[PDB]
């Protein structure tokens, strides 16, 4: 039963960020509980301050008409319960839910470890006759209490794109919102579980470089590439299958080419000291001492530049 | 209480995707948010334009009658909230839902990483003395937003089959539509976390053909095929039981062979070089120093054209 | 307000399977989504064609009586949503379900990879003052549609127990029906992915026969011996803790045993090849390579044909 | 609107197990699906035989005034369809559920692998102004069907405590009744897969003893000292973390020592063979040679009489 | 409804802890079932004792005005089943529920292995027109049965903070109180499966500075530090990203540096020992043989002193 407006009616929203949780990176998803503050003028049920009753008059859901603001990206219906309703006499009213649904914002995991992100929420809400347009009212959209938690990532700012982009979808248009959430990643325990540990392996490869015995040479650089994958298969494991080139998987993949040509000088440092000319073997071991860490300290700033100061 | 017709009524079907996620490929199962558009004449609340009211006359789902459109191949009762109701003069109804269930398609893993899909989403309709015949309104079928996610496949198209298919199913027909979803695999991420770190381990595996010592030319080839299990463990993990062969599994198992032969080669350049015989040993070594990258590169296009170019 | 008899009543059952799902072999479950198909004499409703309505009349689930039918071996509560009522003028009522509910049958794991299995879903219904005898109608009973999944599993036959068992349970007999599900395991990508790469492991193991270095035989057998552990501990995961033994328990422990003497033959060509009598060593070890595969093959066959040829 | 009586009136309870399953011992949970039996005299609702009706009249739910009878040690509130309800001339009640809840009983895992069980189940009732005794009416509790599951577990026995505790809970006096389901572990298969494994290392493990060389008595001891990880870590998973000492916990922690003592040796059999004193040398190798055996099996019996002996 | 005060009307509340469960460090969440007691005086209903009835009258939840009790960091809305209520002559009501949900409170794992813990239940109370307190009526609060598991962990105090904190949210006061669940973790499992097996992996790393042999000294210190990512991976997966360092995070990652260096030693005791000068070698090797277990047992006490001394 819809009021019956002389133009486009708005409705005004807003969200409260009570918690933040469970952000799955595998699954590109997070789960939110927050206040939905909902508004309008539907001057049908004004009522006279004076004449009966009192400021504001409490209803009931199933009494007024109510719009139907749904979210957009949400695995499932919303999950709301209404925390109360409040006509002023002009006949506006004050709805507040306070709903928690688990929401589908993808992340861009091209610095991985070093990322930023920009999580969205939606709230669509499709016209009958008389046309919705819904907008925001910023004194209940400075939603995200000073608790709002998200394990594992620095949360910056909760704010939203006033302007709201009206569609048409199917005959009826319908008004969208965009609400954002900016979030760091809290990279840090990415250094002494991964990151570090990843290296250490790397260097100890390359101690084969002041070796003779083929024997401990490769039960050494082997060895070493063995506890890569372990690290490669951590890694690639609480995280999604990108069409595109993470940072961690560039450097984790950088790596896997300095214990290829690791394992070819053991390899030649010795088809090179059984053809009895070692003048050469402790020649190019000699020198690979230098040109790994190097080439390998250059390629570090060449890919991370290439992915950071680009 | 349903609409006396003359003939097999019409009911008039549509799906517009808001949303795609969570595509399961152990369980093969994903999960899909979308509009159901359904609309059909129901002459018997036809309702004179001028005479009374408006346009056009909102219902509630109590009131008109509503046909039982149930999704054939999912886990549960689909999850859907109505959106609205609105029944034309000529006693034509428009009716709008949005649910989200999860959805039982099946995949085929023949070609794994390179592999290209068609889901499935069903809706029959059964009939009770007038015949339900469904059929697609495709300006309602549209149903795919600019926004469809689903992490880690390219979406290609959502088509459909524009003729049902009309069962006999205990003593009342049905009739049954088929909703298409193509979608092609994210191969890739494939690439320097499975592929290329599989290939890696192969090579320095082999490398024991250019080294003479048994004692380094078995913690060679033998870690390495460890190695190749921690892959083939991690790759039969994220994939089901087919009961055909998958080219990730072929490739995954010809490899098995390399390392085979690969020891065998190290175990009998041994009792051959213990044997005062060199001369075939380092003939042999020699040789397999070829063979092997010959015979996979050659058996790798035989591998490769056998399941892509047929 | 249940139908006023002269006899035990007799209710007419029916299943048509249109979803199988997800068995769980850990812990023994399936979830299964079919059609329930009810039917009895209510002579209490029957309603003279000629001088009212039509030729069958449609009610909702609270105006008639309609019996408890309850599944016996299930989780929770069975879900269902009702399809449609029918009562015929003689007072005979056509009831339709259409629940999904996951389904506790045991498995007989004694032949694992290669076991067929009995399905059941069961049906009792307890009575008040007219007994209640269950029963089948085979029209509605050919429930499992050419479309029946259950992924890695042959599905063989879905028939039932026309004779009900009528228990005595608290002072009022119940009246139970067996449906049974027969399905056969998809043994195969168990070969692959265990059986093979299994067996592959066991062989290279005893390559240390012709060889002679204790330094490498041990880093041989050993090194396997881990492997077999990745593979039991592979297949112990995805499978039960049966009070019996397995097949694949069977000769995944008879193989324990070929790497323990297999370990003990290389120790012992050492205490006896430095103890100066290589008379002996490789005098044992030359047998060993023989001894091994064949007591092997006989085991298997001795073990196979135990299990099932018996 | 309780029923008015003369002192605290008596409920009468039973419970007939339909099905049992889903034991987890790591959550210390599990599902039961049974009949609950409850019975009162109400004889407010006494009635006429004679006069009207029949034997015994047939109530809904909502009639009668029905006792709350809550479970005590439950996840959620209890999931029950109600069976039948039936009014003694007395007015004396007869009410039949068939409830499913999951069960929070405490596990004793002290013998882990061989321990036996005595789950629990509770049903408290809260009184009003009539004080409520629950008692056991052992017709009604019998419940354990000849079909009772539970995977590898065999069930011994299903008895209830007569007398009730009756609290003083809140200002209300409770009545509380103990359900007790006694169960016993299938140990075995825990022999092939675990047990069994698990020493078969072992023993390899100190195989090098009969050994001189380092290289492959390290490449022996070390390479086994992690398979017992390999099982370490998957006995360790499949059980909580107990506060107590396990029988396994103890007997695979002992093991580790029989491993660190293992590689002292053949460490000592070494700086003492590379100070040319092997004179001392192959005299500590050959008493580890039954020093460590004995140790063990002594260490065993004094563990295992430790646990279960006593 | 809402009961015509003359001040801000306080709701008394409590809560009984009946369940305590599946605490969940990787998600930060635990799961609680538990009594919620309100109370307050609502004069409106106010009734005569003599007069009519008796003591004490019971009404349904929808009889009566409640207020809105929302838990403030749950997931989803609490799960309540209403138990009983009872209005006092003097306007005064006393509810009781007995609720079931999962809970979000954060952890401190900066002590991990050995950290205590306070877990938060929140409860606000938003206002209308007559403002809302809460209070704690600490009758009602005693709440936690002789019989709270928490598995694996030691229950210390459930109390509450008797003033609450009066918020404005969106032009309507809300009244916030905080219930406090006290526990210290039961570290000791995590010795014999973590601490130790990863302390005696380190030692046997370092027995080769009694060795010589490079060959079986990389065989041995770098087969040991696979171990330890072993155990590395096992612990960092039963926790969550932390921005902050763990106490086992340390001392795991302090381990891999004594790896590091060790592997250094044996490296140079070799381009040290190839290089005739094995007057330093043994003297190295014969230094770290002290240098290392001391800078250890140095550096955990530095370290450990840092964490909990501090
Ligand atoms: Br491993």
């Given at each position: ?11 005004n929203t807003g969200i409260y960020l009570i918690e ?172 002494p579980n991964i990151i570090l540990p990843m290296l ?111």
């Open positions: 039963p819809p009021p019956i407006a002389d133009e486009p009616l708005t409705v933040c949780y469970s952000l799955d990176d595998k699954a590109e998803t997070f789960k939110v509980n927050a206040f939905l503050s909902l508004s309008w003028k539907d001057r049908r049920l004004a009522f006279d301050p004076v004449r009966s009753g009192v400021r504001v008059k409490t209803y009931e859901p199933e009494a007024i008409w109510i719009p139907e603001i749904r979210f957009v990206n949400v695995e499932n219906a919303r999950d709301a319960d209404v925390v109360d309703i409040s006509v002023s006499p002009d006949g506006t009213v004050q709805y507040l839910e306070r709903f928690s649904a688990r929401v589908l914002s993808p992340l861009d995991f091209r610095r991985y470890p070093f990322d930023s992100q920009t999580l969205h929420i939606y709230l669509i809400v499709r016209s009958v006759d008389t046309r919705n347009i819904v907008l925001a009212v910023d004194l209940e959209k400075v939603g995200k209490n000073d608790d709002v938690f998200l394990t594992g990532w620095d949360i910056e700012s909760f704010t939203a794109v006033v302007k709201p982009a009206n569609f048409a979808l199917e005959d009826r248009l319908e008004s969208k919102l965009d609400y954002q959430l900016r979030i760091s990643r809290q990279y840090f325990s990415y250094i250490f392996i790397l260097f100890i490869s390359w101690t084969a470089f002041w070796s003779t015995s083929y024997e401990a040479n490769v039960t050494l650089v082997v060895s070493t590439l063995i506890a890569h994958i372990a690290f490669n298969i951590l890694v690639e494991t609480n995280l999604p299958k990108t069409p595109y080139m993470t940072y961690t998987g560039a450097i984790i993949f950088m790596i896997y080419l300095f214990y290829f040509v690791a394992v070819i000088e053991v390899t030649v440092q010795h088809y090179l000291k059984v053809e009895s000319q070692p003048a050469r073997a402790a020649s190019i071991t000699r020198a690979s001492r230098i040109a790994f860490p190097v080439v390998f300290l250059l390629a570090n700033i060449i890919l991370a530049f290439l992915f950071f100061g680009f």
